[PDB]
Amino acid sequence: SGFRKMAFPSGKVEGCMVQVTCGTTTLNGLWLDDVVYCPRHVICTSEDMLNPNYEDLLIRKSNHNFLVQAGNVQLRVIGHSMQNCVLKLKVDTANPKTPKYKFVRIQPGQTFSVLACYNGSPSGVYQCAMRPNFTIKGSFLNGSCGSVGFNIDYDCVSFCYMHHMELPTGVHAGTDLEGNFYGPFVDRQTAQAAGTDTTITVNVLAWLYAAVINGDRWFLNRFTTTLNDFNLVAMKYNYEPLTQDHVDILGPLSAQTGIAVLDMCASLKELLQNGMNGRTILGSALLEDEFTPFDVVRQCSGVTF
Amino acid sequence: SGFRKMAFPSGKVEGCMVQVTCGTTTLNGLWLDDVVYCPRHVICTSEDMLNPNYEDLLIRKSNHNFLVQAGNVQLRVIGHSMQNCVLKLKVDTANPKTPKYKFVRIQPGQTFSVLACYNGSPSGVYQCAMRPNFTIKGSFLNGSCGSVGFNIDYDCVSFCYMHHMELPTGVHAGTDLEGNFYGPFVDRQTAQAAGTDTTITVNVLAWLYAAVINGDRWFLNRFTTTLNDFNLVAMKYNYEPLTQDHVDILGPLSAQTGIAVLDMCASLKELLQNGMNGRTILGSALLEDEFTPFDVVRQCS
Ligand SMILES: O=C1C[C@@H](C(=O)Nc2cncc3ccccc23)c2cc(Cl)ccc2N1
Ligand SMILES: O=C1C[C@@H](C(=O)Nc2cncc3ccccc23)c2cc(Cl)ccc2N1
Ligand SMILES: [Cl-]
Ligand SMILES: [Cl-]
Ligand SMILES: [Cl-]
Numbered sequence: 001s002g003f004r005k006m007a008f009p010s011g012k013v014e015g016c017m018v019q020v021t022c023g024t025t026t027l028n029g030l031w032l033d034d035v036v037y038c039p040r041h042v043i044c045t046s047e048d049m050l051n052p053n054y055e056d057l058l059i060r061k062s063n064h065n066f067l068v069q070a071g072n073v074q075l076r077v078i079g080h081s082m083q084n085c086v087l088k089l090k091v092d093t094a095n096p097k098t099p100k101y102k103f104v105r106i107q108p109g110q111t112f113s114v115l116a117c118y119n120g121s122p123s124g125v126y127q128c129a130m131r132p133n134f135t136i137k138g139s140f141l142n143g144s145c146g147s148v149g150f151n152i153d154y155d156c157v158s159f160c161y162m163h164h165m166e167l168p169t170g171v172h173a174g175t176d177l178e179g180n181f182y183g184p185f186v187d188r189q190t191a192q193a194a195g196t197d198t199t200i201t202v203n204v205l206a207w208l209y210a211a212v213i214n215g216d217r218w219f220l221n222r223f224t225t226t227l228n229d230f231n232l233v234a235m236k237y238n239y240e241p242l243t244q245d246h247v248d249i250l251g252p253l254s255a256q257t258g259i260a261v262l263d264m265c266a267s268l269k270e271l272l273q274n275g276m277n278g279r280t281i282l283g284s285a286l287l288e289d290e291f292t293p294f295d296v297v298r299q300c301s302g303v304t305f
Numbered sequence: 306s307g308f309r310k311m312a313f314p315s316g317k318v319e320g321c322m323v324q325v326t327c328g329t330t331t332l333n334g335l336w337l338d339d340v341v342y343c344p345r346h347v348i349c350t351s352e353d354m355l356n357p358n359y360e361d362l363l364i365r366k367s368n369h370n371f372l373v374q375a376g377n378v379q380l381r382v383i384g385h386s387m388q389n390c391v392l393k394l395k396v397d398t399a400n401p402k403t404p405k406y407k408f409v410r411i412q413p414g415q416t417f418s419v420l421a422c423y424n425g426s427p428s429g430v431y432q433c434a435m436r437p438n439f440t441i442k443g444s445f446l447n448g449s450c451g452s453v454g455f456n457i458d459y460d461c462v463s464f465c466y467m468h469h470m471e472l473p474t475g476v477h478a479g480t481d482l483e484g485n486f487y488g489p490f491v492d493r494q495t496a497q498a499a500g501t502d503t504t505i506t507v508n509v510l511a512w513l514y515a516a517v518i519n520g521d522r523w524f525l526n527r528f529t530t531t532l533n534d535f536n537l538v539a540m541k542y543n544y545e546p547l548t549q550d551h552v553d554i555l556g557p558l559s560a561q562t563g564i565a566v567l568d569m570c571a572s573l574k575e576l577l578q579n580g581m582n583g584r585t586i587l588g589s590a591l592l593e594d595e596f597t598p599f600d601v602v603r604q605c606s
Contacts, residue, residue: 001475002444006429009420011316036504115314122605124311125430137588139309141606172518215475245566283442285590305427 003210003282005290007113007127009153009305013159015097018075019058020089020146021067028117029068029089030177032098033281036068036070036075036089037177038146039164040082042186046123049189058082061137069120070095084179085164085187108132109200109240111292112160113148116140129290133195134183135171136161148177152305162266167194170214196228197241200289202246205264206296207288209253211281213300218279219258222265230265236274249293308515308587310595311604312418312432313457313469320402323380324425325394325451326372333422333451334394335464335482336402341373341380341394342482343451344469345387346492363387374425375400375506385475389484390469390492394537408461408482409456413437414545416507416597417454417465434508434595435547438500438567439488441466446604454479472499504544505594507551510569512593515601516586523584525564528571535570554598 013030020029020038023045029038041049043057046286061080066089066154068075079090099291106112111129115122115184128149142162147160159285162185164174173185186193208219231241248263268287276285291299318335324411325334325343329350334343346354348362368382371394373557384395384591411417416434420427433441435456445452450503469479469492476499490497513524530538536546545571555566573592581590594605 001471002442002477004431004433004442005310006421006431006444007312009319009427010314010317011319011427011429014314014316027423116311122314122316125314126311129307129358137306137309138606140312166306172307254367278460280591283591286585299429300446302421302423302428302448304423304428 001212001215003299004117005127006295006299007125008150009196010113010122010125012185012262013115013148013150014098015099015121016118017115017120019069021069022061022065024267027120027143028120028231030146030148030162031068031070031075031091031095032051032101034091034094036077036091037162037185038089039078039162040085040087041145042087046189052071052188054082057238058087059160068112082179083177086162086177086179088244099212099238100157102158104160105176106130106160107180108134109203109289110153110248111162111203113294114138114149114161114163115117115147116144117147118143127290129200129292130161130182130201131171131194132198134185135194135197138163140166140172140223149174155305169194182251193203196238199237199287201234201239201242201268202249202269203289203292204239204260204287205242205246205250206253206293207282207291208264208267209250209257209259209293210258210291210300211294212257213283213296219267219271219281221267222272223270224260224262225269226263227262230262230269233272234270239272252297306519306606308604310432312430313455315418315420315427315430317404317457317462318420318453318455319427321403322338322420322422322425322427324374327366327370328372331424332448333425335451335453335467336373336375336380336396336400337406339396339397339399341382342467343392343394344463344467344480344492345390345392345484346450346469347392352464352491354496356493359387363392364604387484390480390486391467391482391484399485404462405460405588406462406464409465410481410485411435411482411487414463414508414597416595417456417467418453418543418602419454421449422452432595434597435466435487436476436499436507437503437505439468439490439500440472440478443468443477445471445477453482473484474499497573501543504542504592506539506544506547506573507554508594508597509573509592510547510551510566510595511546511598511601513569514562514564515596515605516553516588517562517564518601518605519587521586524572524576524586525568526572526575527565528566528575530571530574532567532570535567535574538574538577539599544577557602558598601605
């Protein structure tokens with residue numbers, strides 16, 4: 001019993017975190033095989049950030065300008081190239097702790113674990129979701145750039161996020177490990193704002209199934225709904241549309257609890273229109289949307305890595 | 306910016322997790338140097354669990370009755386002893402991945418990270434707190450026994466909890482790494498129940514200071530309170546008493562935000578009276594109590 005916001009064990013990623021220093025800027029790098037990946041803005045001064053020409057800034061750098069520190073050992077940089085908003089520093093040594101890995105780009109609503117790092121040293125691990133507006137509500141301070149987001153599928157780490165910046169609202173923006181930003185953001189010190197956020201509907205439904213699995217049924221009702229009527233209601237409350245794919249994905253949870261997906265949608269509709277009336281669900285007074293259907297099944301079945 | 310429930314990176318603990326089997330029972334063990342620590346109830350059958358005499362059950366065991374698996378390698382048990390509710394299995398190999406570590410017994414309100422494990426394999430990491438009633442609101446299934454709670458300070462792992470059981474309300478009970486239970490619990494299937502749980506007041510105040518540090522002031526008011534009037538009001542909402550120790554502990558956060566502790570206590574009294582009126586504090590519609598003053602300072606600017 002119990003249901004917690006749970007991150008993947010971070011050990012496989014911790015063995016990859018390094019410190020990258022270029023001039024006065026110090027941030028985190030991800031050392032996999034003989035390449036260190038880090039945000040390309042490590043080459044910028046605070047003035048350069050206003051309007052950077054990364055190709056021009058990078059062409060002026062030599063391999064020795066990048067100091068890469070792995071624990072208390074200096075890695076020698078033997079090459080450097082840029083791929084989108086990520087800088088790839090070729091090093092002479094393959095990371096002996098390199099896990100089986102892949103670079104994957106995730107979709108909004110998908111969750112991942114963040115290993116927050118400062119000076120190449122892991123400080124904490126937390127779970128979060130890629131919001132529908134492509135930001136992450138992370139917890140990051142200055143020096144956290146280059147911290148990564150990941151999932152573990154069997155013994156393979158899928159790196160999906162690299163931290164680049166904080167927007168004025170305190171939410172965060174970053175890229176996949178190929179340097180493509182999630183969202184309409186650019187790596188420049190300029191006026192940028194996240195779009196209006198929405199709630200991840202399929203994830204709320206998954207969390208309602210987790211509450212039922214854990215013994216909370218007060219919100220269940222005798223009613224069902226159509227997918228079209230539910231989406232009309234859900235659109236009114238800034239909830240993401242629920243697709244037939246989402247309904248299919250919730251199939252196993254529906255079969256385990258005996259509550260059809262459109263039956264759970266009727267519970268959700270009532271919760272949106274009437275609130276919780278002083279009650280909580282899994283210790284929360286708000287509908288939680290940062291657990292996917294897969295996360296719920298994984299936690300309520302004890303999958304290991 | 307931002308404020309998340311954040312666990313310590315679990316790598317240093319993952320390299321210590323092993324599977325311990327005694328007959329038909331399989332649970333997790335913590336392998337540090339040449340000793341594997343695990344709940345003593347690994348020697349019990351489901352029958353034994355009502356009134357087990359652990360000394361009597363253990364005396365009938367030999368070293369070769371305990372199967373310890375570290376990854377895909379079987380460790381050889383060369384000795385066994387019981388210390389309180391923990392079984393210590395001496396093995397013939399020191400764990401090469403043993404971090405710098407310590408065993409610490411924590412007090413209610415303290416937080417720690419849990420590395421939930423099944424069959425010696427880590428499944429997930431989460432953050433929790435030792436409740437005032439000495440239970441933890443964990444997320445654990447059958448086979449999770451032996452999973453540990455820890456904190457990391459500098460490069461040293463302070464092990465503070467080992468999971469032993471689930472109470473009928475779905476909350477969890479366990480021991481420190483010396484095998485002493487937290488709370489009035491016993492490692493028996495006898496009818497046991499947690500005492501009425503209360504909110505960790507000092508932690509709620511710390512989290513209100515975190516909200517102020519992160520730019521949220523809507524809940525502040527022009528009032529102050531005496532510590533005794535605060536406690537009289539707080540107890541009515543099942544909040545733990547706030548001691549002068551707690552007030553002292555909140556000193557640094559009070560100095561950083563410019564809000565005196567008793568001034569923040571008056572905001573808390575008002576929040577308990579009014580609720581949040583559709584507002585949130587750090588993305589939460591409830592008052593959060595699983596962040597200590599130490600956690601807030603570590604995480605916040
Ligand atoms: O001031 C900056 C630095 C950097 C950035 O956002 N870094 C941070 C990242 N995360 C949490 C932070 C908290 C507090 C201060 C900085 C933080 C940056 C990177 C880029 Cl790509 C564009 C602009 C900027 N502006
Ligand atoms: O049924 C039991 C087994 C064990 C225990 O609680 N195990 C678990 C531990 N954690 C989460 C569980 C979830 C679901 C089922 C079991 C769980 C135990 C240990 C002891 Cl010391 C005393 C009594 C028991 N009774
Ligand atoms: Cl609601
Ligand atoms: Cl599924
Ligand atoms: Cl303590």
